[PDB]
Enzyme design. Structure first.
Site, PDB file in Angstrom:
ATOM      1  N   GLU A   1     -58.874 -99.498  -5.039  1.00 40.83           N
ATOM      2  CA  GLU A   1     -58.294 -98.328  -5.694  1.00 40.83           C
ATOM      3  C   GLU A   1     -58.553 -98.362  -7.196  1.00 40.83           C
ATOM      4  OE1 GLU A   1     -54.264 -98.746  -4.168  1.00 40.83           O
ATOM      5  OE2 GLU A   1     -54.606 -97.187  -2.686  1.00 40.83           O
TER       6      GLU A   1
ATOM      7  N   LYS B   1     -41.333 -90.710  -5.703  1.00 38.55           N
ATOM      8  CA  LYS B   1     -42.145 -91.697  -6.416  1.00 38.55           C
ATOM      9  C   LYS B   1     -42.003 -91.616  -7.930  1.00 38.55           C
ATOM     10  CE  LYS B   1     -44.044 -92.711  -2.407  1.00 38.55           C
ATOM     11  NZ  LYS B   1     -45.520 -92.454  -2.344  1.00 38.55           N
TER      12      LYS B   1
HETATM   13  O1  R5P Z   1     -52.507 -99.547  -1.911  1.00 41.48           O
HETATM   14  C1  R5P Z   1     -51.772 -98.595  -1.732  1.00 41.48           C
HETATM   15  C2  R5P Z   1     -51.762 -97.417  -2.739  1.00 41.48           C
HETATM   16  O2  R5P Z   1     -51.227 -97.781  -4.013  1.00 41.48           O
HETATM   17  C3  R5P Z   1     -51.090 -96.117  -2.195  1.00 41.48           C
HETATM   18  O3  R5P Z   1     -51.719 -95.010  -2.834  1.00 41.48           O
HETATM   19  C4  R5P Z   1     -49.579 -96.085  -2.434  1.00 41.48           C
HETATM   20  O4  R5P Z   1     -48.985 -97.190  -1.747  1.00 41.48           O
HETATM   21  C5  R5P Z   1     -48.926 -94.771  -2.045  1.00 41.48           C
HETATM   22  O5  R5P Z   1     -48.779 -94.691  -0.608  1.00 41.48           O
HETATM   23  P1  R5P Z   1     -47.924 -93.533   0.230  1.00 41.48           P
HETATM   24  O6  R5P Z   1     -48.473 -92.160  -0.196  1.00 41.48           O
HETATM   25  O7  R5P Z   1     -48.060 -93.779   1.727  1.00 41.48           O
HETATM   26  O8  R5P Z   1     -46.467 -93.623  -0.224  1.00 41.48           O
END
Ligand code: R5P
Ligand code: 5RP
Ligand code: NA
Ligand code: NA
Lengths: 218, 217
Positions: A103, A121
């Site tokens: 990433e 978030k």
């Molecule tokens: O390695 C994981 C990344 O940082 C993801 O983009 C992050 O965990 C967000 O995931 P979600 O949209 O499922 O909450």
């Protein structure tokens, strides 16, 4: 309002930034996965995607979206990804899903980083969610000792192996007073491959979905 | 006869091996002569930690017990070679491509003994390139960032490290501030580790020449 629905709203809001003939960097996780479904609908309009994880790559190929290796790209106009925490400055904690290394690499090649999140978030101050640190497996105990010296509490993510064959220590209680310095301090430790603090590569835009709609926090 | 010199340096490091020690073992041709010396004192060794899969294979083939680094808390000695070394104990390493686990083991060990023939001794580090281990998909990106640091990266074609990664061998980097250089490489996304050893110095530098072995440090 389903969590799914907020993630879909944020996904569709990123779609508005996709222009014809772009190569698109794609992040990881459940929010990004709704975005992949949105990309499938316009895949004839774009050239290819760069995948930040093997899981993301499988999902893109299942939609018939062309996937290309980052090394075959020098110009990546857009990267779309989620985050575990994000603030209005665009600093993030990523790596809950274990893909933080690729990433960060794709995000650094990309010109524009679009972060897509539901409202849960968004934080005023980073630090409650732990920092995933990817570690060379035979360096695990050494790195954990070094992290403790930094005032972190590392917890080995049992049974997990990253796309790169490494393990994850999820680190609690680090100070985010100087998050760029913190991000470097982890990465300079022998055996640390990368960490989930995104303070040097910020999100350029942060699209936040709630019941009211999608708000450009940044 | 460089081999004779390497053997002399290897034998000189054997004098630091005490009974019941766990011994960290580096990689490369000088270390491989030391592995043969270690075999002659197997009875004195508890076990060895290996800095590469190749070194592990050579140790196991001599019947020397190998233990995983995660099980070791006390690692009193690490014996390794170097591509370049100065009297300060700064080194360039990674000619053999094993620089990532070498640096990890070096950092766990209390005493780092560097063994070299005379040709490895330099007043100023920098003529030998700096091996940088890179997440394979990050290769072109890391190369571009290294160019910004004034280095000329060259992909070591066909080579894959013990950790599944590639090596860019980087030429022409400035060694005016070696520790800051080491850090500036390691903070690049996709860089796993690099061959500058300026933050973890050799504690002893044993230099074999025609006249014998001299402790440069
Ligand atoms: O390695 C994981 C990344 O940082 C993801 O983009 C992050 O965990 C967000 O995931 P979600 O949209 O499922 O909450
Ligand atoms: O760092 C190394 C390999 O990663 C070696 O220690 C270094 O290349 C010196 O090897 P040799 O004794 O064969 O010259
Ligand atoms: Na590191
Ligand atoms: Na790095």
């Amino acid at each position: 309002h389903h969590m799914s629905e907020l993630k879909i709203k944020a996904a569709k809001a990123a779609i508005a930034y996709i222009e014809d003939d772009m190569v698109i960097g794609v992040g990881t996780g459940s929010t990004v996965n709704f975005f992949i479904k949105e990309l499938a609908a316009i895949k004839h309009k774009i050239e290819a995607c760069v995948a930040s994880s093997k899981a993301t790559e499988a999902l893109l190929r299942a939609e018939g979206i062309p996937v290309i290796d980052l090394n075959s790209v020098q110009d990546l106009p857009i990267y779309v990804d989620g985050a575990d925490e994000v603030n209005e400055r665009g600093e993030m904690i990523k790596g809950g899903g274990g893909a933080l290394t690729r990433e960060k690499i794709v995000a650094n090649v990309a010109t524009q980083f679009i972060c897509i999140v539901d409202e849960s978030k968004v934080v005023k101050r980073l630090g409650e969610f732990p920092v995933a640190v990817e570690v060379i497996p035979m360096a695990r105990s050494f790195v954990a000792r070094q992290i403790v010296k930094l005032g972190g509490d590392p917890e080995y993510r049992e049974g997990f192996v990253t796309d790169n064959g490494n393990i994850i220590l999820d680190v609690f209680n680090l100070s985010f007073s100087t998050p760029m310095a913190l991000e470097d301090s982890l990465n300079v430790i022998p055996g640390v491959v990368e960490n989930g603090v995104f303070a040097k590569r910020l999100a350029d835009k942060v699209l936040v979905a709630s019941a009211s709609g999608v708000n450009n926090l940044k």
